[model samples]
Target: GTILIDLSPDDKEFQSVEEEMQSTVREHRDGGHAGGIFNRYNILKIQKVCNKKLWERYTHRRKEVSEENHNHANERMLFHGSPFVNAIIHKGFDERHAYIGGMFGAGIYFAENSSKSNQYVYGIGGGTGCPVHKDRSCYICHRQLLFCRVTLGKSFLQFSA
Candidate 1:
């Protein structure tokens, strides 16, 4: 089962995470390619998700990869943004439900650059409506992004297309 604990907006950890997001985006935009302007986004809410099963699966896979490659599993914290944040938080990532094709093929995509991941994020009510209203019909109006810990074991360089 998955559990989501809301983090207080004033909490140190929450502030730290928010600052990290801001700084990362700033750095990427300042050093990125020639064109395309990137806009910074604000954090609305932060939830700490606890899923024992997923953690166990991740550790198990990391162990398997390490044993097979005879080296340390290179784990990285990457960003994945999506409109279906609620579904992902409750049910975990399902590749079958992902987009069929993309530039780098179809799978669960994660990006080191925050702006790259932010491209996929969409919000309810066109992201302009206020979320704090009496009616509970449409509450979410902000985009959501996930910070994921990914394990990359061995490198496979592809030379040809």
Candidate 2:
């Protein structure tokens, strides 16, 4: 008995392998080694997750802002990465809930901005009663839902709205 192997460019199996290699190459270009591996898993996951229900649940806020908005909530997921945009968007953490001032800009915005520099989160304006500290780890003040950093023994990441 003899076995035959087809190595033609038009061969379906060869074409399949080539397409797969392209996917791997794309993954490599985008994320290097780890990115290539995760890229495959993420592609499978994106196919599974991009349904109507998921869209309406996580990204509906895009439509709510304005009728002429011309965008979907999932755009955030595309722009940011993974489901973090959704994990971030779904929560309404009122930092200034205790204050009588206007409730503007909470959640992920504070998560990124507060710990950058001297950017103080004002509760009553004029930068008084703001959380300020220096540390390599993430911090959140319990009083107002603001972000700060301070070093204790070991550094840690603080996760909240």
Q: What clash count does candidate 2 reach? A: 0
- The digit string of per-residue lDDT tens for model 1 on 100-147 reads 566566767777777666655553212322236322122344557888
**Would you give me the overall lDDT of model 1?**
0.66
lDDT of the candidates, in the order given: 0.66, 0.28
Q: In candidate 2, which residue ranges exceed 4 Å CA deviation? A: 1-58, 72-91, 94-122, 125-161
Best by lDDT: 1
lDDT of 1 at 15: 90
Compose the digit string of candidate 2's lDDT tens values, residues 1-161.
11224356666645654354334322223222211122221111111123344445434544554334443222311111111223322332234222334243342232221112112223222233323532211133322121111112222355555
Task: Report how far residue 87 has shifted in candidate 1, in Å.
Answer: 1.9
For each candidate, what TM-score against the reference? 0.71, 0.20
Candidate 2 global lDDT: 0.28
Off by over 4 Å in 1: 26-38, 123-140, 158-161
